[PDB]
Amino acid sequence: WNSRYSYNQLKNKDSLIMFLVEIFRSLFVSNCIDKNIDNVLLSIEEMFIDHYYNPQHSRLKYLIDDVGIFFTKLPITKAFHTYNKKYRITKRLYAPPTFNEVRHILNLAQILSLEEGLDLLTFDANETLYPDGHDFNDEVLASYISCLLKKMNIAIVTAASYNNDAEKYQKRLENLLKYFSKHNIKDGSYKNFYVMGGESNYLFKCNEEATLYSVPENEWRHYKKFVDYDTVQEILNISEKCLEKVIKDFGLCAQIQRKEKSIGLVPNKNYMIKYEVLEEAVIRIKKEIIKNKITAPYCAFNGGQDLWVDVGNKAEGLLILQKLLKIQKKKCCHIGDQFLHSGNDFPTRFCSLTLWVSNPQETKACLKSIMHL
Amino acid sequence: QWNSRYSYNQLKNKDSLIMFLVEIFRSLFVSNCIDKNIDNVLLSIEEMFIDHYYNPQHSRLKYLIDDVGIFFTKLPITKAFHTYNKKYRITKRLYAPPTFNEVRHILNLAQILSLEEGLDLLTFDANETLYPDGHDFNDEVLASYISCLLKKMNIAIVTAASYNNDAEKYQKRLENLLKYFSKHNIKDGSYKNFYVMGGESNYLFKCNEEATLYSVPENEWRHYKKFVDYDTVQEILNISEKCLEKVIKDFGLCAQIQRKEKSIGLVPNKINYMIKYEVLEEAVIRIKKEIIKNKITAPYCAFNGGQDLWVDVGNKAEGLLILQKLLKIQKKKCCHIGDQFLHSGNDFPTRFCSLTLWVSNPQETKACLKSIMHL
Amino acid sequence: QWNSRYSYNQLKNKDSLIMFLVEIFRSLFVSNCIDKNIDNVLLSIEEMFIDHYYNPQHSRLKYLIDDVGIFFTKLPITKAFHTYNKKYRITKRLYAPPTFNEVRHILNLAQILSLEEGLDLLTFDANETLYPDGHDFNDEVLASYISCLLKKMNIAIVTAASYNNDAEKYQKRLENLLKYFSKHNIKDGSYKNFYVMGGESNYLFKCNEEATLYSVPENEWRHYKKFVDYDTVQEILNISEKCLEKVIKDFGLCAQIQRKEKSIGLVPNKINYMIKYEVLEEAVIRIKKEIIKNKITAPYCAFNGGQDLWVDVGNKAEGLLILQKLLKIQKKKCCHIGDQFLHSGNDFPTRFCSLTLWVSNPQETKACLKSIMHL
Amino acid sequence: SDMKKNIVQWNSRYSYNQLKNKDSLIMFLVEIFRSLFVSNCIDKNIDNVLLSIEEMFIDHYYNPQHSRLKYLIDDVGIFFTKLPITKAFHTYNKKYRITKRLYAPPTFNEVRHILNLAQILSLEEGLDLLTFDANETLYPDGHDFNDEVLASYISCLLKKMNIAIVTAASYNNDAEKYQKRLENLLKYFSKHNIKDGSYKNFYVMGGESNYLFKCNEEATLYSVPENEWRHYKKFVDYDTVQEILNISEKCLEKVIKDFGLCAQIQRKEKSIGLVPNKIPNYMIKYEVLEEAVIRIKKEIIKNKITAPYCAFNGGQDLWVDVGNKAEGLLILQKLLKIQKKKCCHIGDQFLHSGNDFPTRFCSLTLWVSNPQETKACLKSIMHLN
Ligand SMILES: O=c1[nH]cnc2c1ncn2[C@@H]1O[C@H](COP(=O)(O)O)[C@@H](O)[C@H]1O
Ligand SMILES: O=c1[nH]cnc2c1ncn2[C@@H]1O[C@H](COP(=O)(O)O)[C@@H](O)[C@H]1O
Ligand SMILES: O=c1[nH]cnc2c1ncn2[C@@H]1O[C@H](COP(=O)(O)O)[C@@H](O)[C@H]1O
Ligand SMILES: O=c1[nH]cnc2c1ncn2[C@@H]1O[C@H](COP(=O)(O)O)[C@@H](O)[C@H]1O
Ligand SMILES: [Mg+2]
Ligand SMILES: [Mg+2]
Ligand SMILES: [Mg+2]
Ligand SMILES: [Mg+2]
Secondary structure (H helix, E strand, C coil): CCCCCCHHHHHCCCHHHHHHHHHHHHHHHCCCCCCCCHHHHHHHHHHHHHHHHCCCCCHHHHHCCCCCCCCCCCCHHHHHHHHHHHHCHHHCCCCCCCHHHHHHHHHHHHHHHHHHCCCEEEECHHHHCECCCCCCCCHHHHHHHHHHHCCCEEEEECCCCECECHHHHHHHHHHHHHHHHHHHCCCCCHHHEEEEECCCCEEEEECCCCCEEECCHHHCCCCCCCCCHHHHHHHHHHHHHHHHHHHHHCCCCCEEEECCCEEEEECCCCCCCCHHHHHHHHHHHHHHHHHCCCCCCCEEEEECCEEEEECCCHHHHHHHHHHHHCCCHHHEEEEECCCCCCCCCHHHHHCCEEEECCCHHHHHHHHHHHHCC | CCCCCCCHHHHHCCCHHHHHHHHHHHHHHHCCCCCCCCHHHHHHHHHHHHHHHHCCCCCHHHHHCCCCCCCCCCCCHHHHHHHHHHHHCHHHCCCCCCCHHHHHHHHHHHHHHCHHHCCCEEEECCECCCECCCCCCCCHHHHHHHHHHHCCCEEEEECCCCCCCCHHHHHHHCHHHHHHHHHHCCCCHHHHHEEEEECCCCEEEEECCCCCEEECCCCCCCCCCCCCCHHHHHHHHHHHHHHHHHHHHHCCCCEEEEEECCEEEEEECCCCCCCCHHHHHHHHHHHHHHHHCCCCCCCCEEEEECCEEEEECCCHHHHHHHHHHHCCCCHHHEEEEECCCCCCCCCHHHHHCCEEEECCCHHHHHHHHHHHHCC | CCCCCCCHHHHHCCCHHHHHHHHHHHHHHHCCCCCCCCHHHHHHHHHHHHHHHHCCCCCHHHHHCCCCCCCCCCCCHHHHHHHHHHHHCHHHCCCCCCCHHHHHHHHHHHHHHCHHHCCCEEEECCECCCECCCCCCCCHHHHHHHHHHHHHCEEEEECCCCCCCCHHHHHHHCHHHHHHHHHHCCCCCHHHHEEEEECCCCEEEEEECCCEEEECCHHHHCCCCCCCCHHHHHHHHHHHHHHHHHHHHHCCCCEEEEEECCEEEEEECCCCCCCCHHHHHHHHHHHHHHHHHCCCCCCEEEEECCCCEEEEECCHHHHHHHHHHHCCCCHHHEEEEECCCCCCCCCHHHHHCCEEEECCCHHHHHHHHHHHHCC | CCHHHHHHHHCCCCCHHHHHCCCHHHHHHHHHHHHHHHCCHHHCCCHHHHHHHHHHHHHHHHCCCCCHHHHHCCCCCCCCCCCCHHHHHHHHHHHHCHHHCCCCCCCHHHHHHHHHHHHHHCHHHCCCEEEECCECCCECCCCCCCCHHHHHHHHHHHCCCEEEEECCCCCCCCHHHHHHHHHHHHHHHHHHCCCCCHHHHEEEEECCCCEEEEECCCCCEEECCHHHCCCCCCCCCHHHHHHHHHHHHHHHHHHHHHCCCCEEEEEECCEEEEEECCCCCCCCCHHHHHHHHHHHHHHHHHCCCCCCCEEEECCCCEEEECCCHHHHHHHHHHHCCCCHHHEEEEECCCCCCCCCHHHHHCCEEEECCCHHHHHHHHHHHHCCC
């Protein structure tokens, strides 16, 4: 699930997205991008199916060595037409398609592949629902989530750990539960709504009063991979020792914060820390946990201007709900922003469909496209 | 010297000089020797930058990097890396290599230390470097750094914004700046050393002793400008507007065409609806390639900046060229500060006539000025 | 006309137009659609090759590739692809994309199929495209093609080989070709359409009724040669000679310098001790950068042969211009076959005044002539 | 890892990106030397950079799985010795003076030479077994041994260490047919080596790990009893050999129909080959041969065959052998009780889809282009003591 951290894996943006960018770029250069390129697009699709069936020996694997596993047949041809007709990006003559645009097309393809249905949908609460640290105050998208909960399960998986205090999480979602009591409380859908804490440590359901409450540990401790309490603390001690050198190596205005099953450094009044120092820290931390031969599920991610290390994994959270709610991976989806190799949403590619979002407005465009299907 | 070199390599690849240094530091990073005395590497890079100042078209640097700008000064790249590294210690990194923005600051500091001969003119890009885009200047810290520099040399505000000759609408954009000038820059003769250039090189302004900007007559400095008649200025507009109408049609865009004397813009409206960044690039080249189709050699500039497109019949290099001819200061002692230093930006042509400092936000301009004053 | 410069990036990728097609085909190969009906991609490429022929200054091909030369003819790249594909089926490859050299064969074929209007002059690099380096002509198959082609057009031998001005030396190179001309090309007047240009563009020779070369009177063709005086010729030789004498020292070369009137070169000692190809490519750029440093503007050429280096006062581009002005031949009716079309090769400047076929061995030239005869 | 795992990853975990760059480690040094040349500092004293490169090489000798070198280059081999890349650069540059170049950077082939020289200098602890790729490194492709100078070096080394010849040539068990390829070498061995006991130290391996021969006191080559060394080799069922041979054979037929080729299919026991038709020899495209090797490999895994094989490109030939040169080296290391640190191999096919590539998994390797380069190696090897 990790330990494949390579130099080449860091400097290059994305294996799959750039793969389509370079093909579109050459198509743009040959001046044939506006003509019917269905022959090219379907051959791209012909591979995506061959990678769905034989993901270990597909030709897509020979071209791109580090491809994730495809859980559905991706209609990349329909995804291009639908995105093209709306934005007319092919109408350009001097500006090639952008990595960001191909990520948009790739996300649309994963939505159309859900023609068989969708049983579970999860969100990365931070920066995909509301900016870093801010509270939920966008009333528009809350109507989308309420409608989808009527036809599927909705979960919130966010690396923010507030221990087991269920009351603290409501302040982050008070406006959301307010919309649930007005519509979902009459329906029978409110019980299908869950919230995950840490990355996979604190689970809360939803009561009849649109109130978040803790879940008995005996209801899902067997679904979670049991980890020695001594090993958990060791991971934090390895991290706490590593961050001190990081703050000592580069003189910076921050300090370390300790919790139960999670630690991270946060800049104090705040004085920003370079994006590369946080990148350096994740690889420093990972190489040490490798050196100590720790196999427990963990994660270290570079999100915004703070670094954290949790003894949970955002993929284990999806794995718990699937084993708990009797849901397959092919009918599971997750929306997040940290989809780089130093992000905590990347592990979700190993067990669920994924949608890469840069700001909460794109989640509105994501769910809006999902609904009209 | 028309900037007509619209090249696919200019759009596809970033700054030539910066990425040249990044790859070198990357090999120094990968070889594990970046934390040792790498002075032998840095000295040869300086040896190259020195010879480029002498033979810019036959240097080994121009053979390596074709399409280099021009070095108006001898650049101390060794001392700049030495002093940048001591503050941030990027070199103590083991798994993340030196990045693009880091070398951007190193080259900025390299240009700053090159002013051992002295500095006689500063220019500031108004929007995005002195205040956020579409805002009024609201900063007391920045104005305090500028005030001390105003006594040492002449300072100018060269912007791309255009209000037609109305000096009252310009002081509104930088109210708190004149307020600080009213307090500390009146007794000194520095009040007669501050300039403001609206449009792009079209509307020149100055400061009165009562600290409210006044517009300078046209007949005093219009002769320094390139003679562009009113008929050709409007065809550059007309051809542009015809191209923007195609852009509103070719792409579903909720955008308005703002027409003024000597300028055309592309602005959306809120129900603002954000235009795609890549269409802006596509439209800039459409306008430039269409103007050359009519053999128009008039100094113009079409640029995508922030969230809107504007085409001015002035040039932001002309503005710096005007002030160099007015105050009789060679290009060696003139420096510019802006955020639009890509091929699509409007601060780029100043590389042809003045030293340049690449900045992304107002906080870096304050960090720029603080280092420029400990000289 | 002037000989253009070079960037270190331009020295890497041998030909930009060829490389421009390779990366397109590679994305076609990568996308799994290479062996399907890809004519939309092919015809669109032809659309830019046509638009660059009609408007070479402002074309999208000029926009994407900055150093694109001049298309003297409409290039049928779509038919050339199908033709080369049907023979070798390079599109049936699944795990290896089409190569640089394969596109070279296609680009040559597209240039050949563009000659539907006709040819008036065909020229041959003598060394390495008619016979191995430094050998006498020995091939009857190839001789029949040149013989049959000498009936329908003019045929000239343009080689940088310099034997001053005695046709006996040049005949030893082309003995077996001239004896074949006696048996078939004398009953008619075809031998009066054969030429041999000595020393790139310094010596001219014609054929004679006895199947023997003679030197054309200097007055008959000297006015087209851009005059270069004894002083300027000797400055180029001396500036070069000084460079080679350092090139020998720095790398401890086992080689010698050979001086002639209007030419100088670096030859290995007899034993034939191999001399590094990298040092040869360096000696070109060392000399070229020195000649331009001394403001020399005369037509010269420093080229990197297989096992030696040579500098010649004159070049094959001017040599073709001499023949085109001699026989009143238009540019669009000219063609040249050579082996070194790298930027440091004496056949590269022909791109500026003729159509070109890039070959690497005498076997590849027969494939060109057989394809040319079958039209 | 274990050799069975390496062969599994070699014939099943290639990549288009990895097959583009010939060697990941040579390209590693080329990029660094490129920037050093681009930075203009490459002609000054650069022990600054080189020593740091050596430092990472040493850390990789001790910690191959979690080293900084393995971070930068994902697919590094395993270093059996400490490479003095600083001395190899000093030694190679003082001869050729490639740092005096101002407008031409060092090439892949030069860094390949420096890396060979570093591998040679790493043999300070001594050498006990030296093996040679026969075709194109001892004599041109398809020829017989007709070089006197080479025999003088090999005979001199034969007195000091064990010598072997691992080749892809596959004459079933006719030692007279192998003698014809090297008769001038055994002719020199008879004149200068029968006096020593060194002729017993000389071995020849046919097939690729299938046939073995030793030198007689009469300088003649004789077959080695299979009861003496069959056990060291991983056994392959007769049904699985012909399965490999047949699944390959079907592909060469498709390659001839796809691309119109004047070529034939030679069938032997434990070996198939795609050989070209005679001229009245025709030439087969290099990219087609490279294409078919991937075609062979891609289909063998589709049939879930895991036996050790080797599909390889021989310049003008395409062959598949049940067996590989890494297996043949293991058998000689198990036969003469020789550790990998004191064994070396010289060959020309060190690319992926190459004959001598699996040698990197169990020996020191020298990447040589022709017998003239083979001499420069053995000349530098003799200069050690
Ligand atoms: O251990 C935790 N305790 C409190 N906050 C955390 C913890 N881990 C991550 N965070 C922060 O909360 C957010 C969680 O990331 P997410 O996966 O995008 O929701 C980020 O802004 C983190 O900086
Ligand atoms: O002609 C003009 N009239 C009014 N606004 C303009 C004009 N030209 C540019 N602008 C806007 O004002 C900004 C000034 O750019 P800057 O001062 O160069 O950073 C531009 O980015 C546009 O948003
Ligand atoms: O100046 C000259 N005099 C005599 N031989 C020359 C001269 N210049 C070049 N050569 C040799 O003749 C060859 C002509 O090559 P070509 O131009 O490709 O025909 C060169 O590669 C040199 O070996
Ligand atoms: O199985 C085989 N039997 C006979 N000849 C072979 C066989 N395999 C390859 N060959 C040819 O013989 C050469 C010997 O290979 P090498 O000795 O490893 O260089 C190859 O390059 C092929 O041309
Ligand atoms: Mg997030
Ligand atoms: Mg700006
Ligand atoms: Mg030649
Ligand atoms: Mg071999």
